[PDB]
């Protein structure tokens, strides 16, 4: 190392992404067992899906982060923050989670999908990379909103599908349901000048928002996106087996809903009729630092009485989940390493050192 | 554009996380007489900032984890294998986000470091201090902390080699080297160096030492890594320690390399401080931890045992007032959004959220 | 006398189940200055008495719920029809006693609804309170309250609109007329009325409103049951909240009716009141729930929040005096027995019991 | 007019009792399994029995209130209460739980039963409905004091059992036990002018109080009226199996000891060698306002060092009671409606309303 031959460009260029390729090189090497299917939460409400038939996709992949500066202390006219909420001061939204996978070092997968068009649920960096890194299979799937951000970034048209609700895409040995989105902050995202006052723009949902529910030979997985709450779970929980829920979950500022609180968690694990319901989005933004722990003493409180069916698991940014191996697991824990612990002696100035 | 965009111009656009926000932060801000503030910068970092405007910069480290899986080996003799008669990789993955960029940093008195381990000390701090900062700018730390700086080009007139016992004023903060109890420390030795031989025991005063800061709003005690000692009670029993740092998380079996929930609770009262705070459980994957075994705990046995310190949780990049906020036990990043409402919303009807 | 005895005359002998206890108990009460006091009737329906004995009921409902299972079937374009697709009946059976005769009322100022729903507004109540009372009494609500009073036979003089930002005075009170999140009363329509239609949505002032009442002693909230909306936060920015009532109770899968456990919590943030209250968590079997939700959500966020307000748990028919009873975390009906051992037991030894 | 056509009287009449005959329709067309009994909760100890094979019965049904006015200063002379505590003021006894069922809508019974002659225990209402509505068939069953009651009130004397304890008595498939009662209170609930400082008053528990053991083929329930606490339960649990035990609880104001403790309900279900305890009567009177969690948390702390057999149910007045099928559950939810929902699509102005 040397002092002279530093530079702010070199020093990030050496260390980020965090974890460098550890979890691409993961996703690669895993064998999923038949009827069994294991995702990783990439951290926000990106997931990696992964199944038995080693069919491969990424949802809501998001290499972004938030605020870089405070120099601009105002917020962009009607962002929807402004919409929802008549402020005019710059909102303090700081990334709060690692990036755990290189989205430059993807060498194998089916598609590419995004819930809506917010900014933390698409990626034109992630676009990028699939398009240099992969064959001409790799298919853009998202709401009519998503395919114009991907075209208008130069995704080829033909590497697009545009889902829309009731849709049945198969990708690989995976079938893709596309369900309604409940994500209200995504009705007033409007671009400057359109209006948000006209109520005709709340039939807008179908064309820039969806929810997914995959399903696999292990079973089924429902991405929300960010969807608040709406009794409509109950309508997809009646159609469809549900067995694994993800639904964003966040502490909102006062005067503002943008996620779902730790009652509607419950509630909408009930609504879908989950087996399991994960909490994600919840790592990400500074501002809306949360305690997933009130989920899981609700849950307690609320089982018996209300007969609920599901569990609830926590997970971490970068961490593995698989189903149905996993159930009955609520609490995730990182790989401790040192399996091979005293495999040979230690080395210390006498044994009880440490 | 798609086309446009490279892996290398992804991350110089993206990263680190929050650029130079907390550095802008931590400029603007006017601590208040007879109290200081402190940031939590991940891991042990810490940026201190006094009422007389001086500025310190403790363990800052801008380091990450495994990048690759690729080499399945761990190191021959890395401290790991001393300890634990183990031969592969360690899964350390680091955890949080970089909330100060070095490269940005302007207005600095000091950059301390408590010991030499990777985590604790950084060459692109070093780099970034040199470039940007006056020559006054002081590298503070146990003898093998300089001679790390020192080898990496730091010349030596900026270095003041940290011992036990010395007292050191910077600005208005005056800063006391102490003993640190960091176990892992004293057997982390080169490659053909032996850690059977017992000489290697009186190691520790020439490259880990712990500090007592005192500033004209109190005291902190930056601890380093250091494991539990029955000696915190000597640093306790000879000064007022208001605020203790200790480093927590949850040991992989087999593994002793941070203290334990019981012992964070028994160092503060061995150091017979005001607030105890956590530090470096953020930082490493496999040691992911529940910080709410210290509050449990502490809930458990504060009266029986007349316990006279509250602890508080913290999060990366926040900051911290003593006295001021003393009592707080949850730290929240600002939520934002304190002027909701000055104008009327922009809705399809009023009650659509 | 079995043979004297029919289902009327049980029936009559027996109900309402406190008789007029607490129309006496409210009669009787003596406000001290800068006070109020407020008794809860059931559902949202509330008494409140001012220090300069103002005395107004709001939502007070005195109906029951479904009364036999023969009709199995919902009223088409019920609003649970509307808004759940459904076809059978509601099993929606009172589960709260009736604390207050209101045929025992002899002394108000106005009856206020905040709504049109039935279980807000009460044909016997406006009965007895033109039967007993004088002519000065005022029956204020949004115009579908006005026009539900009007067509039950209340007099057009005795009716005021409360239209939202109206401030009206009774007596020593200052009423504020403030929007409502009553997001079912959008959709309560009549049969052969379109709930697809957007234009309903611009329909809430005219069937629902909140209620600030600002007295000597402080002001009370009454929200009706109103959902969450952000929009609380601006009542709260523009008026000083002390007490906040708010619905509550459980859902039914794929129903929204009331707010959650943690929107108790977020509406008095938003409010930035002092007390929050649930109520309306008494009166539906098949709302059945666990106010200990919001306890203890309560204490697992108010330090890392900094919440300003605590949670109070009251019982159908209890009192409530604020300031007095700030503080109180939860109602006891009187125990009694305040002159126990008055004289000596008669027993036949003293450690009987 | 609406307003003109409305007296005191009419609203009574058409809002009261407050289930009218959904509970009287709900027993009637309840099918009881075979191998298994069900039970409602009528308020206070109020309970309804129905068996497999049809035999139902009534037991301490009660459809009195409480006070109805403040305006009686003084409490009875030489009330129990009087008596116990040497007070002189009211008591403020009202009544706090709403009545599920109409005693005149009863067409189906076998026999009324009785624990004790306490006012809160027996009614005059419901006997004039059953000897109304039914035929010759139905036995009023109840200790000496409780047939003497219902005499005076001209139930004819052919209908009554005197139950006393050792009795065994026989009503369709179901055998009901007669055992002791330790409602100390029944001791000195004397009429004026008759002493209890008199010691031979000791000997009277007997001819007016009693507990029940009901065996029914699908398990047995032990109704201990409103029983104190007595070492003496563990001699019925010796010498009987019993399933189900139904023990009074509440808060007892200071000074005053009329209901067990949350302890005693522990001490009782152990002594008793039940396999689920279930408070009753803590619904009743505002004046014991009670909290039913801390016989769930003591339950909780002692379960494993003191090796309990049994588990708590906590029950809600109207609320149906199925053994041994609710063997399990803890915490009783009244039906929460909406089974059919999303049978049909909503009727709102866009899907995201709610
Ligand atoms: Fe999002
Ligand atoms: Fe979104
Ligand atoms: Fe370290
Ligand atoms: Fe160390
Ligand atoms: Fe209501
Ligand atoms: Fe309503
Ligand atoms: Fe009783
Ligand atoms: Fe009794």
């Known amino acids: 190392s040397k002092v002279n031959e530093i530079t702010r460009e070199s020093w990030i260029l050496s260390t980020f992404p965090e974890w460098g390729t550890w979890l691409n090189e993961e996703i690669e090497q895993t064998v999923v067992e038949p009827n069994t299917f294991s995702m990783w939460w990439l951290g926000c409400t990106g997931i ?4 038995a038939g080693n069919t491969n996709l990424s949802i809501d992949f998001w290499c972004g982060t938030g605020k870089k500066t405070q120099k601009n202390r105002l917020m962009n006219t009607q962002h929807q923050m402004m919409r929802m909420g008549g402020v005019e001061a710059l909102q303090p939204n700081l990334r709060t989670s690692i990036f ?3 989205p430059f070092a ?4 089916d598609a590419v999908l995004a819930s809506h068009d917010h900014a933390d ?8 990379a699939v398009l240099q890194n992969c064959g001409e299979h790799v298919k853009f799937i998202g709401p009519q909103a998503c395919v114009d951000l991907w075209l208008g970034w130069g995704v080829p048209q033909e590497r697009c599908i545009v889902a829309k609700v009731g849709d049945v895409l198969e990708i690989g040995d995976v079938k893709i349901r596309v369900l309604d989105s409940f994500d209200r ?3 007033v995202t409007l671009p400057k000048g359109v209006s948000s006052y006209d109520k005709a723009i709340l039939d807008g949902m179908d064309e820039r928002a969806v929810n997914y529910l995959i399903e696999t030979s292990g079973g089924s997985v429902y991405h929300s996106g960010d969807s608040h709450y709406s009794n409509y779970y109950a309508k997809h929980g009646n159609d469809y087996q549900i067995d694994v829920a993800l639904l964003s979950y966040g502490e909102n500022p006062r005067g503002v809903t943008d996620k779902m609180t730790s009652s509607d968690v419950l509630r909408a694990a009930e609504s879908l009729d989950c087996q399991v ?3 994600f989005h919840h790592d990400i933004w500074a501002n809306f630092q949360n305690d997933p722990r009130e989920i899981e003493v609700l849950w307690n409180m609320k089982k018996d009485r209300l007969q609920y ?3 609830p698991f926590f997970w971490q940014v970068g961490g593995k989940y698989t189903y149905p191996t996993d159930k009955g697991r ?8 040192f399996q091979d612990i005293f495999k040979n002696e230690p080395e210390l100035p006498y044994k009880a050192f440490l």
């Open 185 to 187: 902050t995504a009705l």
């Open 106 to 109: 993807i060498k194998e997968i």
């Open 330 to 337: 609520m609490h995730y824990q990182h790989f401790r390493g």
């Open 48 to 51: 990696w899906l992964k199944s």
């Open 309 to 311: 069916q599901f569990a």
């Open 100 to 102: 755990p996978l290189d």
């Open 277 to 279: 319901v994960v909490p």
């Open 121 to 128: 649920h698409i990626d034109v960096n992630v676009a990028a």
